[PDB]
């Protein structure tokens, strides 16, 4: 049971629970990586225990060391080049996560100020199925 | 087979394999949190598969969300307060891990500039026995 918690944190197993599904429409496009990073960081600060970012074609499991780089219209998230609209699935307390997205002056203003829109849906069940890139150990062995 | 690999990845169990032992003597003391974070990231760069940070009395198993705060002489790593000298154990290709330590402009140069010393010992076997202690998830459950 310690293994489950550690495995969810590292993104090595899928997770399910209550949470939110956030859609970001970015017609400009204008949402730069810094804005996406702020959104992710605010969700984590608000208690999200698993986060996945999707576009129409790809899904990425977010970890604490995830890279989000690129330009509006083309955000590279742990190597996957995503284009809008984006979907963010986050497991946590749904009204807490929604409130975090509605803080005056908060992360969502980065989306709004570039002509984007954010819809935050609260859900009884959100499935974070994407896994972080697995790699086999070449040197470490069990004791 | 897969359970052991996962368990090592997430820091649920100990690991053994070739690697390095890094000793940092800090007589000032002058080694700040930033330098220890650089040590960890250099070792990760070089392909470290398990990392443990020791002082004379305590041990911390490094993981993806490991943080370091504090001041020279008293570094808090994942809630454990450590004081020099420090010992860092890392499992990986010993020549690659050693090479990382010798790259100019990083952690070793930071140690040197504050009057400290680093010793890097390559070893055919290093044991990482400290385990990570996960926080209880309130919302996410495994699938």
From Swiss-Prot, chains A, B:
What's the source species for this entry? Mycobacterium tuberculosis (strain CDC 1551 / Oshkosh)
- Report the domain of life of the source organism: Bacteria
Measured against the full-length protein, the chain present covers 149 to 291 of 292
**Can you say what this protein is called?**
UPF0749 protein MT1873
Q: Which family does it belong to?
A: Belongs to the UPF0749 family.
Compartments where located: Cell membrane
- What residues form the membrane-spanning segments? 4-24, 81-101
């Amino acid at each position: 049971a310690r293994l489950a918690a550690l495995s969810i944190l590292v993104g090595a197993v899928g997770a399910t629970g209550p949470g939110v599904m956030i859609t970001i429409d970015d017609p400009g496009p204008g949402v730069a990586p810094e804005v996406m990073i702020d959104v992710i960081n605010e969700l984590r600060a608000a208690g999200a225990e698993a986060i996945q970012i999707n576009d129409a074609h790809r899904s990425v499991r977010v970890g604490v060391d995830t890279w989000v780089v690129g330009v509006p219209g083309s955000l590279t998230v742990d190597t996957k080049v995503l284009s809008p609209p984006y979907s963010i699935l986050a497991i946590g307390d749904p009204p807490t996560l929604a409130a975090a997205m509605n803080i005056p002056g908060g992360a969502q203003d980065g989306v709004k100020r570039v002509g984007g829109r954010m819809v935050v849906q609260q859900a009884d069940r959100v499935d974070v199925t994407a896994l972080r890139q697995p790699k086999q150990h070449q040197y470490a062995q069990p004791v």
